[PDB]
């Protein structure tokens, strides 16, 4: 998985 | 050989912190200040990711990786051979992110509107009649407006998007979207492990399913609620009836013990957006762990801004790769679920400043479902009667159970709606479920999942699942069921680390070192090692269980079998096939 992590985010 | 690999490994870390620090401040600069110039911006810099993942991605694949002694350095090329959609070819590549753009796009600008009323917003408008509104037929407004609006809308672009995704995973080496999704816990009997955990908080659930159902009996009246079939979806106060905290009000064991309404307290007290993160970032100091950089308080958007409109209002941390820059982005309101929401994202923040030294690459959590648990350990405390108290927002076996209840409807109600989501999309990516099954499907597992039923019969055209935000975003959803689990794996471990004794619930870790301490050495391991062992770290064992959330619901669960037992309720929804007249 080599994109940058997304910026996180509740359920 | 090993030489040629850790060359490869720190070119490509020195060369992905720079275009990921780029690729975030435009993604920043854009979501807090929608512009054709910010938008600009953006598109560029997706380009330049997809050009350099191709371009490192390419080389990433030139070596044989089980070829290699060090295991950190096998990890980081293992991980920079999957190009994810940057693998497309150039016009499908393009296509897939106007597809993105656009289900994000009709997602977001969706309003439910009255004839000559005024157009409703998801948030808060909608949330709020769903939270708020005890009257039926208001309930079913919202509840369908929302799904005619914005999920019909997005039907349009999901099977598309679903062979696109299918085709960049394909290209990965995977068989399907689905299977590169579970690949990121890295555990090849995760289905098996999933079932087992969910077959284990069944009982708890279907009892919990039970009274609420009975509540419901009594307010809605006997006509619109059978007490051997599925609830209604759009009865539980929340829009995906997700979680059910917000009808506490309704299935209160005990209204004889009486509690402050947190809101009402926290608006007259002045209570700010500022306020309740400067409050969290107070609970993790106190833990010893790490204080936002002063930097976090300057370019934070903690609430709307006035000077002008056009900003994405969903809440989010941000890391910016930089080891100095982390932002949290949330239209906050002032209340209690905003106030335990706001800790969770510091917890993502807390967990960004602790990997922070390690390669890009490995700034992760252990898996994604560890991510979501620090945030969820820390606000279990806060969430304590004791706590918040101390907070001036409350003031007793009969307040035990009404407590234990309202986190039931928080925790326990989730379990089931986090399992569903992507147990449906791992058969629309597999092939099992096709676009003329979509709609059905989903309220197959909708019923045996949760128990719930649609208000309203479904008719062709409808996409329900398109209605939640991590459908047509595309974030995988399975990290929260993950999530909730080893939450109470990691309360039951700091609790008796901070040397608490009694029931686990009642454990409130503020101001523990030793449990701080704990948190510390497991986040600073980031993606580096394989997740069991961030895992034995924090719990002395390797796995998930279910014991721990099944120890802290005990006393909940033996009272809801008495009571259930004793009103005559079946456990279940026997009648499975009943929906309202
Ligand atoms: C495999 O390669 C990795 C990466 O090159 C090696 O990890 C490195 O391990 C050392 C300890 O042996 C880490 O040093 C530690 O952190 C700081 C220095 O940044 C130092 O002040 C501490 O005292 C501590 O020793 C180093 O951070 C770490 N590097 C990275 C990038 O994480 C590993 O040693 C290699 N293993 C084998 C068996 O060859
Ligand atoms: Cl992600
Ligand atoms: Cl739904
Ligand atoms: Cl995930």
């Given at each position: 998985?080599?994109?940058?992590?997304?910026?996180?985010?509740?359920? | 050989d090993?030489?040629?690999?850790?060359?490869?490994?720190?070119?490509?870390?020195?060369?992905?912190?720079?275009?990921?620090?780029?690729?975030?401040?435009?993604?920043?600069n854009?979501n807090?200040?929608?512009?054709?110039?910010?938008?600009?911006?953006?598109?560029?810099?997706?380009?330049?990711?997809?050009?350099?993942?191709?371009?490192?991605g390419?080389?990433?694949?030139?070596?044989?990786?089980?070829?290699?002694?060090?295991?950190?350095?096998?990890?980081?090329?293992?991980?920079?051979?999957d190009?994810?959609?940057?693998?497309?070819?150039?016009?499908?590549?393009e296509?897939?992110?106007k597809?993105?753009?656009?289900?994000?796009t009709?997602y977001?600008?969706?309003?439910?509107?009255h004839?000559?009323?005024?157009?409703?917003?998801?948030?808060?408008?909608?949330?709020?009649?769903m939270?708020?509104?005890?009257?039926?037929?208001?309930?079913?407004?919202?509840?369908?407006?929302?799904?005619?609006?914005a999920?019909?809308?997005?039907?349009?672009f999901?099977?598309?998007?679903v062979?696109?995704?299918?085709?960049?995973?394909?290209?990965?080496?995977?068989?399907?979207?689905?299977d590169?999704?579970?690949?990121?816990?890295?555990?090849?009997s995760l289905?098996?492990?999933?079932?087992?955990?969910?077959?284990?908080?069944?009982?708890?659930?279907?009892?919990?399913?039970?009274?609420?159902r009975?509540?419901?009996?009594?307010?809605?009246?006997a006509?619109?609620?059978?007490?051997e079939?599925?609830?209604?979806?759009?009865?539980?106060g929340?829009?995906?009836?997700?979680?059910?905290?917000?009808?506490?009000?309704?299935?209160?064991?005990?209204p004889?013990?009486?509690s402050?309404?947190?809101?009402?307290?926290?608006?007259?007290q002045?209570?700010?957006?500022?306020?309740?993160?400067?409050?969290?970032?107070?609970?993790?100091?106190?833990?010893?762990?790490?204080?936002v950089?002063?930097?976090?308080?300057?370019?934070?958007?903690?609430?709307?801004?006035?000077?002008?409109?056009?900003?994405?209002?969903?809440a989010?941390?941000?890391?910016?790769?930089?080891?100095?820059?982390?932002?949290?982005?949330?239209?906050?309101?002032?209340?209690?679920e905003?106030?335990?929401?706001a800790?969770?994202?510091?917890?993502?923040?807390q967990?960004?400043?602790?990997?922070?030294?390690?390669p890009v690459?490995?700034?992760?959590?252990?898996?994604?479902?560890?991510?979501?648990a620090?945030?969820?350990?820390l606000?279990?405390?806060?969430?304590t009667?004791?706590?918040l108290?101390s907070?001036?927002?409350?003031?007793?076996?009969?307040?035990?159970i009404?407590?234990?209840?309202?986190?039931?409807?928080?925790?326990?109600?989730?379990?089931?709606?986090?399992?569903?989501?992507?147990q449906?999309?791992?058969?629309?990516?597999?092939?099992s479920?096709?676009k003329?099954?979509?709609?059905?499907?989903?309220?197959?597992?909708?019923?045996?999942?949760?128990?719930?039923?649609?208000?309203?019969?479904?008719?062709?055209?409808?996409?329900d699942?398109?209605?939640?935000?991590?459908?047509?975003?595309?974030?995988?959803?399975?990290?929260?069921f993950?999530?909730?689990?080893?939450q109470?794996?990691?309360?039951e471990?700091?609790?008796?680390?901070?040397?608490?004794?009694?029931?686990?619930?009642?454990?409130?870790?503020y101001?523990?070192?030793?449990?701080?301490?704990?948190?510390?050495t497991?986040?600073?391991?980031?993606?580096?090692?394989?997740?069991?062992?961030?895992?034995?770290?924090?719990?002395?064992?390797?796995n998930?269980?279910?014991?721990?959330?099944?120890?802290?619901?005990?006393?909940?669960?033996?009272?809801?079998?008495?009571?259930?037992?004793?009103?005559?309720?079946?456990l279940?929804?026997?009648?499975?096939?009943?929906?309202?007249?």
């Open positions: 998985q080599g994109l940058p992590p997304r910026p996180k985010i509740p359920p | 090993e030489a040629e690999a850790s060359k490869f490994v720190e070119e490509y870390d020195r060369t992905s912190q720079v275009v990921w620090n780029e690729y975030a401040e435009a993604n920043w854009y807090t200040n929608i512009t054709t110039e910010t938008s600009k911006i953006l598109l560029q810099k997706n380009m330049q990711i997809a050009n350099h993942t191709l371009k490192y390419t080389q990433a694949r030139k070596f044989d990786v089980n070829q290699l002694q060090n295991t950190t350095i096998k990890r980081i090329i293992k991980k920079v051979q190009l994810e959609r940057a693998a497309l070819p150039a016009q499908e590549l296509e897939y992110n597809i993105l753009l656009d289900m994000e009709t977001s600008v969706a309003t439910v509107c004839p000559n009323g005024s157009c409703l917003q998801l948030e808060p408008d909608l949330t709020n009649v939270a708020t509104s005890r009257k039926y037929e208001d309930l079913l407004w919202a509840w369908e407006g929302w799904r005619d609006k999920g019909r809308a997005i039907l349009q999901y099977p598309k998007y062979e696109l995704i299918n085709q960049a995973a394909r290209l990965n080496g995977y068989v399907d979207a689905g590169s999704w579970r690949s990121m816990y890295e555990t090849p289905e098996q492990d999933l079932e087992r955990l969910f077959q284990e908080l069944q009982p708890l659930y279907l009892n919990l399913h039970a009274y609420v009975r509540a419901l009996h009594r307010h809605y009246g006509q619109h609620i059978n007490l079939g599925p609830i209604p979806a759009h009865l539980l929340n829009m995906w009836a997700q979680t059910w905290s917000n009808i506490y009000d309704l299935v209160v064991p005990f004889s013990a009486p402050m309404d947190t809101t009402e307290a926290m608006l007259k002045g209570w700010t957006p500022r306020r309740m993160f400067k409050e969290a970032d107070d609970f993790f100091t106190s833990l010893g762990l790490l204080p950089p002063p930097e976090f308080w300057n370019k934070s958007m903690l609430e709307k801004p006035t000077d002008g409109r056009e900003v994405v209002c969903h989010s941390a941000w890391d910016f790769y930089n080891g100095k820059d982390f932002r949290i982005k949330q239209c906050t309101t002032v209340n209690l905003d106030l335990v929401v800790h969770h994202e510091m917890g993502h923040i967990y960004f400043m602790q990997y922070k030294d390690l690459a490995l700034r992760e959590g252990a898996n994604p479902g560890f991510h979501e620090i945030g969820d350990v606000a279990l405390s806060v969430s009667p004791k706590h108290h907070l001036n927002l409350l003031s007793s076996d009969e307040h035990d009404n407590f234990l209840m309202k986190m039931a409807l928080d925790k326990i109600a989730f379990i089931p709606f986090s399992y569903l989501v992507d449906w999309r791992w058969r629309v990516f597999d092939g479920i096709t003329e099954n979509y709609n059905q499907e989903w309220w197959s597992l909708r019923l045996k999942y949760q128990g719930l039923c649609p208000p309203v019969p479904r008719t062709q055209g409808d996409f699942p398109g209605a939640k935000f991590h459908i047509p975003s595309s974030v995988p959803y399975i990290r929260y993950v999530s909730f689990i080893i109470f794996q990691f309360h471990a700091l609790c008796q680390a901070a040397g608490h004794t009694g029931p686990l619930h009642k454990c409130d870790i101001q523990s070192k030793e449990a701080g301490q704990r948190l510390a497991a986040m600073k391991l980031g993606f580096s090692r394989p997740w069991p062992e961030a895992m034995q770290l924090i719990t002395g064992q390797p998930m269980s279910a014991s721990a959330m099944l120890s802290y619901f005990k006393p909940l669960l033996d009272w809801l079998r008495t009571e259930n037992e004793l009103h005559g309720e079946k279940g929804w026997p009648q499975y096939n009943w929906t309202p007249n």
